[PDB]
Coordinates of N, CA and C in Angstrom, one line a residue:
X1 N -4.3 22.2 -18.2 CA -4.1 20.7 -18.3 C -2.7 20.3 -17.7
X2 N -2.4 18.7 -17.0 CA -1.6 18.5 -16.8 C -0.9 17.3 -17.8
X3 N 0.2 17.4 -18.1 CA 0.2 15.5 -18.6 C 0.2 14.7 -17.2
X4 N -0.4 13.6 -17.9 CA -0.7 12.6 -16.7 C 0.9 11.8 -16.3
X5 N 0.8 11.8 -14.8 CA 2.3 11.4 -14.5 C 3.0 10.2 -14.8
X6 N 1.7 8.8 -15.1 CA 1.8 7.8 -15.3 C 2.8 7.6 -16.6
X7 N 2.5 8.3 -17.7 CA 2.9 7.4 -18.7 C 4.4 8.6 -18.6
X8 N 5.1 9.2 -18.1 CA 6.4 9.6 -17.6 C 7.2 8.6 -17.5
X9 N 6.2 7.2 -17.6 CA 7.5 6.0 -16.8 C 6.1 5.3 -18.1
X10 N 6.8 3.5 -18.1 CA 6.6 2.3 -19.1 C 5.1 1.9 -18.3
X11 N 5.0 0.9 -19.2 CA 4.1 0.1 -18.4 C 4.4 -1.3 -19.5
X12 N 3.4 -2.2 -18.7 CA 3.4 -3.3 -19.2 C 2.1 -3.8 -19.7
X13 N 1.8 -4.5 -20.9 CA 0.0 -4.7 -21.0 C 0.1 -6.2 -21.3
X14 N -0.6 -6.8 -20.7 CA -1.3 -7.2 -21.4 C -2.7 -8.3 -22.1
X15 N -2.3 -8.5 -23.6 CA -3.6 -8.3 -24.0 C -4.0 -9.5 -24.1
X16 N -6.2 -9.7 -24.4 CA -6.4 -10.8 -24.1 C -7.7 -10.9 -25.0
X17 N -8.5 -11.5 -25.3 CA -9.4 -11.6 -26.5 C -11.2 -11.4 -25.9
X18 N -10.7 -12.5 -24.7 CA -12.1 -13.0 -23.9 C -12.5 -13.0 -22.6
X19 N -13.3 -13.0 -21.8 CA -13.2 -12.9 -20.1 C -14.1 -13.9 -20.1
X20 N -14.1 -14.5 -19.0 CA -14.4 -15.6 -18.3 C -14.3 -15.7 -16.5
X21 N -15.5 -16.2 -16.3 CA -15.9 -16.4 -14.9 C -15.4 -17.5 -14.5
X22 N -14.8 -18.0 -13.4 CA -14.2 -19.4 -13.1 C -14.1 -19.3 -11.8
X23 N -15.1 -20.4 -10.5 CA -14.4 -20.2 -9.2 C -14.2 -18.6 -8.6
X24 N -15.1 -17.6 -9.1 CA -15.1 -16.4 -8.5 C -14.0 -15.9 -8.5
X25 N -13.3 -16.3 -10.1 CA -12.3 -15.4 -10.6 C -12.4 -14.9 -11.6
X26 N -12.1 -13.6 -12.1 CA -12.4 -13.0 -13.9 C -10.9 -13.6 -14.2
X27 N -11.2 -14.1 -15.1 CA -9.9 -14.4 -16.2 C -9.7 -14.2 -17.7
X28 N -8.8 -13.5 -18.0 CA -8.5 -13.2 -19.1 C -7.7 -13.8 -20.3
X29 N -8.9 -14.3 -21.1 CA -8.3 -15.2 -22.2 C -7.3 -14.8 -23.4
X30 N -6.5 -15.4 -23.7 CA -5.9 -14.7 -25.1 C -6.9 -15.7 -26.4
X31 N -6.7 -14.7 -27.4 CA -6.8 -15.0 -28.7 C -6.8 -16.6 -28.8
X32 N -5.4 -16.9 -28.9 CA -5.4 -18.4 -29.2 C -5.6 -19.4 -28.0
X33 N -5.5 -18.7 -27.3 CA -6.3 -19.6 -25.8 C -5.5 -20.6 -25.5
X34 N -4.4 -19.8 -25.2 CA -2.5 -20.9 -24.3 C -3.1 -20.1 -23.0
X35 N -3.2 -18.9 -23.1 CA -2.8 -18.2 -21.6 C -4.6 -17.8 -20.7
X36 N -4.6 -17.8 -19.7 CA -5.9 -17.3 -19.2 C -5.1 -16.1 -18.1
X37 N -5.0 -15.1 -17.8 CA -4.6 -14.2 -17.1 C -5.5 -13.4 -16.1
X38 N -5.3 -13.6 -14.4 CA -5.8 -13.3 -13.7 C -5.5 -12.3 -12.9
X39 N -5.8 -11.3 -12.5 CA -6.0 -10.2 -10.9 C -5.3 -10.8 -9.5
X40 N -4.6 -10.0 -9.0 CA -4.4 -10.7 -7.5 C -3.7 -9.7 -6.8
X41 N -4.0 -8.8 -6.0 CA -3.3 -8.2 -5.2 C -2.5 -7.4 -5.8
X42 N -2.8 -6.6 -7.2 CA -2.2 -5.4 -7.9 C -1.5 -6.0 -8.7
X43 N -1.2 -7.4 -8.9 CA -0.6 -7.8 -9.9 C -1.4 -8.8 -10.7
X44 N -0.4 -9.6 -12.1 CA -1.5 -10.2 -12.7 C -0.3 -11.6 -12.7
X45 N -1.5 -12.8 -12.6 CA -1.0 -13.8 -12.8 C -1.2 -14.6 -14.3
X46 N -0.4 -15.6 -14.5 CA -0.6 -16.4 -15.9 C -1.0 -17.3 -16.0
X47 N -1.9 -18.2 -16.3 CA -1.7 -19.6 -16.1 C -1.9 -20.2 -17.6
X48 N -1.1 -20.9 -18.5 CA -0.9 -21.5 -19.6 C -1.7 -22.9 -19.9
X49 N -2.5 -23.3 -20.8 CA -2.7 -24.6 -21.0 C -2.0 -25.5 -20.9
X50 N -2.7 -26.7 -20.0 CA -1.9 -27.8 -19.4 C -1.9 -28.8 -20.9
X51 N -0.5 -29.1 -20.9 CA -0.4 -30.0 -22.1 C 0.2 -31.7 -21.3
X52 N 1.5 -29.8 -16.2 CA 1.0 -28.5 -15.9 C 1.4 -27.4 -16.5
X53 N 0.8 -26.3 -16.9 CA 0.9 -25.2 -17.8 C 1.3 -24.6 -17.1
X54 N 2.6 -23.5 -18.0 CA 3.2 -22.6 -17.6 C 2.8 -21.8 -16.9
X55 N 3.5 -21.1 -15.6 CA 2.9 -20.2 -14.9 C 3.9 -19.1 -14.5
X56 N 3.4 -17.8 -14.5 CA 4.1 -16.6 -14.7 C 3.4 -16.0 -13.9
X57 N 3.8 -14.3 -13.4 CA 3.3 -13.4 -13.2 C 4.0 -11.9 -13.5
X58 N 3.5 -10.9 -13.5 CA 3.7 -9.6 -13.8 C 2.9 -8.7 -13.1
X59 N 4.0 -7.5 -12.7 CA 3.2 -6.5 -11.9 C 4.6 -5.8 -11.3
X60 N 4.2 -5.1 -10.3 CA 5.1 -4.1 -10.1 C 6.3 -5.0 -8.9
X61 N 7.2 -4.9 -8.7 CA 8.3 -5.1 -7.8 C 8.6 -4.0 -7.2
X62 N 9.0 -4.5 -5.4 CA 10.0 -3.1 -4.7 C 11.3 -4.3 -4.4
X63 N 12.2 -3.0 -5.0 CA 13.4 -3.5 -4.4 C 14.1 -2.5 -3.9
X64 N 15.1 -1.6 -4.0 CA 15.8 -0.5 -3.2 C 15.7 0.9 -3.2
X65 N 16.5 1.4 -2.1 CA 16.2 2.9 -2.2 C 16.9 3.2 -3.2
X66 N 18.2 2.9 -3.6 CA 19.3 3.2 -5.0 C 18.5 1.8 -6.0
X67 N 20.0 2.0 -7.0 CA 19.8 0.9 -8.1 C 20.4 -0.5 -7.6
X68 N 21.4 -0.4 -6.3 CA 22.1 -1.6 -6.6 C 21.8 -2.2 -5.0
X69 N 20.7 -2.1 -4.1 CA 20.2 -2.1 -3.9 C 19.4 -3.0 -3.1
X70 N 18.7 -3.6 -1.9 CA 17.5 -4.0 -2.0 C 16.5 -4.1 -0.4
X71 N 16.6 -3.5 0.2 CA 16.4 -2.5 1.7 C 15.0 -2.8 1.6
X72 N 14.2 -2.4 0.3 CA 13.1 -2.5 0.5 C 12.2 -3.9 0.5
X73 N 12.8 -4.9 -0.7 CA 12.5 -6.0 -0.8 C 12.8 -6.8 0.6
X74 N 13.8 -6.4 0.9 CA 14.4 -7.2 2.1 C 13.0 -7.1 3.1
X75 N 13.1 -5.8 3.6 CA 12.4 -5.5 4.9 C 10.9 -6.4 4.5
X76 N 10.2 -6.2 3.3 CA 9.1 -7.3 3.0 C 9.5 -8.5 3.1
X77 N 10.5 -9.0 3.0 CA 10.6 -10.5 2.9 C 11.2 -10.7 4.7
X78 N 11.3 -10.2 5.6 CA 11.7 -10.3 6.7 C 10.5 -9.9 7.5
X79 N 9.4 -9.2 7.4 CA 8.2 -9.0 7.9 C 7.4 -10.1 7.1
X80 N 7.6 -10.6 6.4 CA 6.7 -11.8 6.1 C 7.1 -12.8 6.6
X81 N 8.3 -13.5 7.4 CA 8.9 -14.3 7.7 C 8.5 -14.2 9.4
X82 N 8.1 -12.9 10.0 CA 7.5 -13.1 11.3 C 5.9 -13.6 11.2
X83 N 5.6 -13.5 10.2 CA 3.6 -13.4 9.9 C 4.1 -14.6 10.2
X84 N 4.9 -15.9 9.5 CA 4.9 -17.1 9.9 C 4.3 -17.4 7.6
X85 N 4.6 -16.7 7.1 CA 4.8 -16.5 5.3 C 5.9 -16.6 4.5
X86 N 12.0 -14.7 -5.8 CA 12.6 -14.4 -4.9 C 12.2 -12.7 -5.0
X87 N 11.5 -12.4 -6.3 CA 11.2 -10.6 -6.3 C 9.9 -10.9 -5.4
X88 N 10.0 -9.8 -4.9 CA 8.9 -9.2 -4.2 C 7.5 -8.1 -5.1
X89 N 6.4 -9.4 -5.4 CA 5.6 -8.5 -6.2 C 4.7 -7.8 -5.2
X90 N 3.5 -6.8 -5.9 CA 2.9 -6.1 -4.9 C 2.1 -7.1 -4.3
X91 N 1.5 -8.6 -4.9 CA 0.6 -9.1 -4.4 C 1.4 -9.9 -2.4
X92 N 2.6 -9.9 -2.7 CA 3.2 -10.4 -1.7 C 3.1 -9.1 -0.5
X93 N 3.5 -7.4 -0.9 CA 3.1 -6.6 0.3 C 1.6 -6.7 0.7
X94 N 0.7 -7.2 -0.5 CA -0.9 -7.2 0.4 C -0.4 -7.9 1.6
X95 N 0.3 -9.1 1.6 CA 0.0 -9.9 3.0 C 0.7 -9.7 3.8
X96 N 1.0 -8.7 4.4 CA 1.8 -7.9 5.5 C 0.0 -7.3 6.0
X97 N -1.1 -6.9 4.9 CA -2.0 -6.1 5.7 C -3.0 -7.1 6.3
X98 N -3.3 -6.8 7.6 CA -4.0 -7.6 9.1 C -5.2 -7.8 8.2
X99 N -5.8 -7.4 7.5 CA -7.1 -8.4 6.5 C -6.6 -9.5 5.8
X100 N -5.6 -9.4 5.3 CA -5.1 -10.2 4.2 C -4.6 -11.9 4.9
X101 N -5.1 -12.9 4.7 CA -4.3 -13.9 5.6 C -4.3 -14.7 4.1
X102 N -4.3 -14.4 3.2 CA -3.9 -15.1 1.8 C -3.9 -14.6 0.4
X103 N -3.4 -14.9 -0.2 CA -3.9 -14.5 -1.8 C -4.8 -14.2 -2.4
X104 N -5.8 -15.6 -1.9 CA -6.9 -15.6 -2.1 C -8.2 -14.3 -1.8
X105 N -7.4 -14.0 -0.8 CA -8.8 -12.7 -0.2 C -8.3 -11.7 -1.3
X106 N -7.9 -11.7 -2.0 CA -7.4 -10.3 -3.0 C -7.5 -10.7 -4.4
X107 N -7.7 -12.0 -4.6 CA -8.1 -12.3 -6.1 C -8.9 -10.7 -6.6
X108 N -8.8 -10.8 -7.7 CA -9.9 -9.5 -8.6 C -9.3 -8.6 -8.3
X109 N -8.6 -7.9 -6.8 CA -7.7 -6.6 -6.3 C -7.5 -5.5 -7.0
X110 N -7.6 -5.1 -7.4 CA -6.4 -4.4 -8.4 C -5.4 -3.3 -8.0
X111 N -5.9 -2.7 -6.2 CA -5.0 -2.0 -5.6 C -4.4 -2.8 -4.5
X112 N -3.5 -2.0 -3.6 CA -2.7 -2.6 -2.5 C -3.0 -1.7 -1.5
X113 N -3.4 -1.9 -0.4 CA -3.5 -1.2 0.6 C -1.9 -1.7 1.6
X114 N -1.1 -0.6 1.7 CA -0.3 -0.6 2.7 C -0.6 -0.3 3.7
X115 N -0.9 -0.7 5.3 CA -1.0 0.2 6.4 C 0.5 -0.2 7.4
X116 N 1.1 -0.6 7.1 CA 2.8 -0.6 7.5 C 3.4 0.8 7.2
X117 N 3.8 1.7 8.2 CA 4.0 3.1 7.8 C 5.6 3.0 7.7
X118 N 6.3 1.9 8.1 CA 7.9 1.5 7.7 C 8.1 1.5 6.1
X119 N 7.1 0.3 6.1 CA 7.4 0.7 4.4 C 6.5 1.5 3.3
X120 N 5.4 2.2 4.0 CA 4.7 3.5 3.0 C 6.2 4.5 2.9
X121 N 6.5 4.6 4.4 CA 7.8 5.8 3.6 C 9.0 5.3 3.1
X122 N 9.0 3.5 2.7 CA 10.0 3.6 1.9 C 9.5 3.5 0.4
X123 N 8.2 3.4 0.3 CA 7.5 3.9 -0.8 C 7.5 5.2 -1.4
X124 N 7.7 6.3 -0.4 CA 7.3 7.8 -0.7 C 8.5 8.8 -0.2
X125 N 9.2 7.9 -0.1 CA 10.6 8.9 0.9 C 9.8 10.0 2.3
X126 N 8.8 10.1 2.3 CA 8.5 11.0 4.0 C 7.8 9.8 4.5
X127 N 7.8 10.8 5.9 CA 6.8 10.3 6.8 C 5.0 9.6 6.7
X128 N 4.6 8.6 6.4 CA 3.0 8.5 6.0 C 2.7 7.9 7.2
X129 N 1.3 8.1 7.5 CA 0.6 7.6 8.5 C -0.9 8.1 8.2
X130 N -1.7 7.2 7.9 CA -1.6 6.0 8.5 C -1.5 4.5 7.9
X131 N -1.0 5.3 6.0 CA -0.7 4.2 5.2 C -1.3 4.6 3.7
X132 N -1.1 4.0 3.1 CA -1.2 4.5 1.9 C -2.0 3.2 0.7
X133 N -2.7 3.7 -0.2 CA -3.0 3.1 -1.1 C -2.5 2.9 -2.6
X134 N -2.0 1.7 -2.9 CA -1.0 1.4 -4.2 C -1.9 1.4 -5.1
X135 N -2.0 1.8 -6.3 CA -2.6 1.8 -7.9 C -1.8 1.7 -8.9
X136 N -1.8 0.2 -9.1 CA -0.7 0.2 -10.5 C -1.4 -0.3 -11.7
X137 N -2.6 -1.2 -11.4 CA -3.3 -1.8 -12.7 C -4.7 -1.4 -13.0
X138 N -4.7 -1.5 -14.2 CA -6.6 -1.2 -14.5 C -6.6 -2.0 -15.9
X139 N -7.8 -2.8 -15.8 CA -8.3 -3.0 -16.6 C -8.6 -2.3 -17.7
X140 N -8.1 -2.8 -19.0 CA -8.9 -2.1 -20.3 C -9.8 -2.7 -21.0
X141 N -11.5 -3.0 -20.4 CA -12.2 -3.8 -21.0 C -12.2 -3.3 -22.4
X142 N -12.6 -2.2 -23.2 CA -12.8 -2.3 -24.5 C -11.6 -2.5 -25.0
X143 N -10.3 -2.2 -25.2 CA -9.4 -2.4 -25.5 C -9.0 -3.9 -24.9
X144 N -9.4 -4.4 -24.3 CA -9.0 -5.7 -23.9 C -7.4 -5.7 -23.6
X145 N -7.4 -5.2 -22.8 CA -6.0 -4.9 -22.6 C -5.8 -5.1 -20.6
X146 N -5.5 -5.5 -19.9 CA -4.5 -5.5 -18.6 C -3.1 -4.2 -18.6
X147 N -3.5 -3.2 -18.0 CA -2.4 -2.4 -17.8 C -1.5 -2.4 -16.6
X148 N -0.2 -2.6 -17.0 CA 0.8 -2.4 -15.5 C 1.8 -1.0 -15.4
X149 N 1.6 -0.2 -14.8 CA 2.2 0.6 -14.5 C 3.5 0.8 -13.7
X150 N 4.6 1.1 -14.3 CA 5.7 1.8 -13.7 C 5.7 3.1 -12.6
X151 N 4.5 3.8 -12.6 CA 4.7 4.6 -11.9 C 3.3 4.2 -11.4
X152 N 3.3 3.7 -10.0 CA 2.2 3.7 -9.6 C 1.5 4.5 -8.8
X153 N 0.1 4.8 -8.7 CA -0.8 5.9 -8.4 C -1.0 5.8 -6.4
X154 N 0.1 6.5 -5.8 CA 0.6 6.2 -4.1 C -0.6 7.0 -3.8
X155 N -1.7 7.0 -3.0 CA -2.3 7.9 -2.1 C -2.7 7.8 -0.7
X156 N -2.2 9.0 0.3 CA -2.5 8.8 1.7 C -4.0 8.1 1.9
X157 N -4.5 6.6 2.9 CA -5.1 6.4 2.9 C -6.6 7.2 3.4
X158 N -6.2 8.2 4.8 CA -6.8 9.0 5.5 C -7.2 10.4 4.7
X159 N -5.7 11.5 4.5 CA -5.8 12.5 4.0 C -5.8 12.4 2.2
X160 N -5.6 11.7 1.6 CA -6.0 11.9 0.1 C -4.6 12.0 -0.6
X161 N -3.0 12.9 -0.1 CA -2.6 13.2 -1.0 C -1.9 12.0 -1.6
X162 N -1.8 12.9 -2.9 CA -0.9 12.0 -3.5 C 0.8 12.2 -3.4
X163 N 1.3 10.8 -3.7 CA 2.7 10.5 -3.4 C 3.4 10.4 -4.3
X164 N 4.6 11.0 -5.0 CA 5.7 10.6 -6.0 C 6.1 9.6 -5.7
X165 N 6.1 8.5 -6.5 CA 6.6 6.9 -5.8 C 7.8 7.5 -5.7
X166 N 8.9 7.1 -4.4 CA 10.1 6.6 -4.5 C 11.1 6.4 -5.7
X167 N 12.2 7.3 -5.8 CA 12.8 6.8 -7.0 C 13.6 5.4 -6.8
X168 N 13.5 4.0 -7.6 CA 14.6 3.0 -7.9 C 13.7 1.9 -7.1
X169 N 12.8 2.6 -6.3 CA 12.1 1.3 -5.4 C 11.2 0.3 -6.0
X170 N 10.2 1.1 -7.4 CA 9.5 0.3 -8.1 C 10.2 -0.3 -9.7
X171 N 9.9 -1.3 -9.8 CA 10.2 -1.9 -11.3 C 8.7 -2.5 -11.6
X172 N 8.8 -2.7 -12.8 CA 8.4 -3.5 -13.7 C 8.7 -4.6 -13.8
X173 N 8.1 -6.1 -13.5 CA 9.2 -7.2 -13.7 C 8.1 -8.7 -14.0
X174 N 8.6 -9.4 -14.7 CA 7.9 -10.6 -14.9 C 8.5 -11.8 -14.3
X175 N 8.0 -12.8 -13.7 CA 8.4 -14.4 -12.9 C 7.8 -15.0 -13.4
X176 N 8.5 -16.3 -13.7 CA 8.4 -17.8 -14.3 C 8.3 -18.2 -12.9
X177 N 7.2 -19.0 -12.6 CA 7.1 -19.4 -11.2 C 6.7 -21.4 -11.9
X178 N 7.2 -21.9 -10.7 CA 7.3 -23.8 -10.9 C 5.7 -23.8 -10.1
X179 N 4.8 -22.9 -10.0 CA 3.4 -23.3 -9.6 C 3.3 -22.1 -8.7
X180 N 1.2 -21.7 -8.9 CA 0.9 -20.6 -8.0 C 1.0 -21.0 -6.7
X181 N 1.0 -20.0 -5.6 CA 0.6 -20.1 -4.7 C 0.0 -20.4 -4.2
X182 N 0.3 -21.8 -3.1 CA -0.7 -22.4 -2.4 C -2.5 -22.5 -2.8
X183 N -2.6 -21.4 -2.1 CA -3.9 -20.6 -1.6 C -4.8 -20.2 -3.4
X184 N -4.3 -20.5 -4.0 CA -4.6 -20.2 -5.4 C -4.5 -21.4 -6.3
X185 N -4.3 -22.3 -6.1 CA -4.0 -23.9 -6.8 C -5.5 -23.9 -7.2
X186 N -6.3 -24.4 -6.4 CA -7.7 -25.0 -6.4 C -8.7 -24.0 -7.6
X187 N -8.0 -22.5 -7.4 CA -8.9 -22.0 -8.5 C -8.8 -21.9 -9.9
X188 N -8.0 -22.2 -10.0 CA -7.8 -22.6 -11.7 C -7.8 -24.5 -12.3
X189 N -8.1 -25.3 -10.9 CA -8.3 -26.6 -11.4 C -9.8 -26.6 -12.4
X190 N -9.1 -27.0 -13.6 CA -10.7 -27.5 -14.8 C -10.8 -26.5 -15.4
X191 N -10.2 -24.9 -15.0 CA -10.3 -23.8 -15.8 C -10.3 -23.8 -17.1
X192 N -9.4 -24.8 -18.0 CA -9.0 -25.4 -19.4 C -10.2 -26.2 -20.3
X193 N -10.9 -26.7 -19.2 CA -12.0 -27.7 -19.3 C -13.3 -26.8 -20.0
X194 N -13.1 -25.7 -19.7 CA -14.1 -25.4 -20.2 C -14.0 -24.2 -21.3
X195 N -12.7 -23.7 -21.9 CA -12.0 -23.1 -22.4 C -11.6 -24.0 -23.6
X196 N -12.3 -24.1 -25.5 CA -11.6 -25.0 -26.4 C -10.3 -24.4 -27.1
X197 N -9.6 -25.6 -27.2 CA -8.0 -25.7 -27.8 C -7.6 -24.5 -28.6
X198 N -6.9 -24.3 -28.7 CA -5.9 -23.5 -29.9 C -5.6 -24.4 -31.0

């Protein structure tokens, strides 16, 4: 047996009571029904009852090859700036990939397909080609739980292996965001409507 490499590093959960279909999104209710929490491109978003409701998200960040740092964040936010597109979650590297032209196409996601081999190896410290697959969340339907992982599950997309993330490149990190993105507005309109009070 091995220990499994994930829980070596934190994670983040979290948890929710109820699921719900809305606009061809799964959303995840809490208990007292403030928060409904959704899937998007390896990360998870929040959206709070409108009394417009708080909006958050959580999931994995790249920032640098060291701690003080941010090479990696940067190079994503400077290749998204040629697409014609302030932490850098994983749902933001989906749209660097040539399928991806929104948020939207990755709703439910739960992994990241990198095929940018600039920044798989600043994911993996070597050489990758022809790109790599990110795994950082899974659902825990019986446990009703959203899991975020610190060490996320890197594998070559072609040959299989697996990759030691990068050390300092990934965090764990949560954002207070002033509204989702764009491309995601429309699917949570009325979501509340059919969801009763706390």
């Amino acid at each position: 047996m091995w220990s499994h490499p994930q829980f070596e590093k934190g994670s983040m959960e979290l948890s929710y009571a109820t699921t719900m279909h809305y606009r061809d999104v799964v959303f995840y209710v809490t208990t007292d029904r403030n928060r409904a929490y959704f899937v998007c491109g390896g990360c998870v978003y929040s959206v709070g009852r409108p009394c417009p409701g708080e909006i958050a998200k959580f999931g994995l960040v790249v920032r640098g090859t060291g701690p003080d740092d941010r090479v990696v964040a940067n190079y994503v936010r400077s290749e998204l700036r040629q697409r014609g597109l302030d932490e850098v979650f994983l749902d933001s590297v989906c749209l660097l990939n040539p399928n991806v032209s929104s948020e939207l196409d990755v709703i439910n996601t739960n992994d990241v397909e990198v095929l940018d081999e600039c920044l798989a190896e600043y994911c993996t410290s070597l050489r990758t080609s022809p790109g790599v697959l990110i795994s950082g969340l899974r659902v825990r339907a019986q446990d009703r739980i959203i899991e975020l992982f610190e060490h996320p599950t890197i594998v070559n997309v072609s040959s299989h292996f697996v990759y030691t993330p990068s050390p300092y490149v990934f965090a764990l990190a949560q954002a207070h965001l002033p509204r989702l993105p764009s491309s995601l507005e429309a699917l949570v309109s009325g979501l509340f409507d059919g969801i009763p009070a706390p």
